From a paper:
In this study, we investigated a donor who developed a family of potent HIV bnAbs with different lengths of an insertion in a critical framework region following infection with two founder viruses that were closely related and underwent extensive recombination. The bnAb lineage is defined by a CDRH3 length of 22 amino acids (aa), an IGHV4–34*01/IGHJ6*02 heavy chain (HC) and an IGKV3–20*01/IGKJ2*01 light chain (LC) gene. A greatly reduced ability for donor plasma to neutralize N332A Env-mutated pseudoviruses of different clades identified the V3-glycan bnAb site as the major target for PC39 neutralization breadth. Ab crystal structures show an extended CDRH1 that can help stabilize the CDRH3.
(c) Ribbon representation of PC39-50I Fab with 11aa CDRH1 insertion. Structures of all three 11aa-insertion Fabs reveal an extended CDRH1 that provides support to and stabilizes the long 22aa CDRH3 (Kabat numbering) of the lineage. The glycine at position G100C found in the WIGEL motif is present in the UCA and only retained in 11aa-insertion Abs. This sequence provides a glycine hinge to the unique mature bnAb CDRH3 structure.
Numbering used by the authors:
A (entry chain L): -1 to 27, 27A, 28 to 95, 95A, 96 to 214
B (entry chain H): 1 to 31, 31A, 31B, 31C, 31D, 31E, 31F, 31G, ...
Amino acid sequence: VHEIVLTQSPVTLSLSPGERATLSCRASQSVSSSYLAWYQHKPGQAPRLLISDVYRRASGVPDRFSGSGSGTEFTLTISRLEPEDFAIYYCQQYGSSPPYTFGQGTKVEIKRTVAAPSVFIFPPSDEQLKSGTASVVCLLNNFYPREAKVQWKVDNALQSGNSQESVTEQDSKDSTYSLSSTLTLSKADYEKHKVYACEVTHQGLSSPVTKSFNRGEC
Amino acid sequence: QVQLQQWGAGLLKPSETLSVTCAIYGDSLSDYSWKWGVSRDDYYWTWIRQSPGKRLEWIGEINRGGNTKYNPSLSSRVKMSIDASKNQFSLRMRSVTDTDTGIYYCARGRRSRQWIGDLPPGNQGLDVWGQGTTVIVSSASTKGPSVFPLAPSSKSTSGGTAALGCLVKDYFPEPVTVSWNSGALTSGVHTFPAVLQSSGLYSLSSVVTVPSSSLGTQTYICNVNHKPSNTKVDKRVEPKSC
């Protein structure tokens, strides 16, 4: 438990290309500047070392990546952001004392205008119902920012503990997100009700949006 | 140019022994000639891992001479070997449980106090990484997915545009690939990251937005591929009224 613990801030940084990015990494106790390293990580790709030793750039690291620190607080700075620089960034203590622990990571996100999601709902299929289960899907298409609230209501009653959510990466085209929420019940629990509704709260919506259906319609 | 490559994949039941290997290219481990740069004894061949909802974890390291150093959280179950006859090094993790699922990387850490001429950039860090080996520990058996049609209806239509999709449910393990119309449909497709249910099986969705008027003209098929179970399923998503 002698381990140094690193903590990064912010959890998510939302900026545009060409802007200045600054990421903070705070150590629980003072670490020598010679043992603080930064890494870049993109999903599906291996992590790449950026800053190491005494704020020295690694191989093939452009000059827009710089590093500073005081022993307890360290900072990775990107002067101007190229599109290829939006990713995850980690800090690590390496060389001081094992284990060589990391930070929780900071995500760099593209900041665009506010976009409201398109809300769609899909009822269960006969194929799934013949197996004893019913899944209702609610899709939020192309929205920004990523903060969105999806609630399931069955006969005007809020559900809890029987739904799952999933969000896509930021789109390389319009820089939006998409969310899929799946509510799953048994065939009995499903057929014991009538109205199934998906309620969506988002910054781009003045009032929440409800997409509902009657089980008797389908 | 020094590269690392990781071969294989991990599919284990709880209590079994994980074994992963890493191969080095662009440098020798049996080369005891120090005439420039850092000594090859300053290289520490490292295993790191990351679980989907967690931070990177330094598993451990072994050097050219055989000296190992292990994270105390794993040190009781972890063994690390190296051999210069193949320029490879391997990790053995006993008593694996569900908590050990994740991506396992091999890397090269560098810790040098002395050098001949120039200290190459990347000291005091992990300067070369492998691409990552996927490892899944679970009691579940390999199971191909059930593909159900998220049928388009009036409740999935907005301004001449209709959403339709495929629910790829109850499969194990990751991953699955999803294409539409045998790859001939790519615009406006969103395939969501799989979510692990409490049953130990994965589920995800793949949706696409098409013209509404085309729903009577075009036939839409989703092609789901699950390699671990050796399954391919072509499901036709037919419209519906609700």
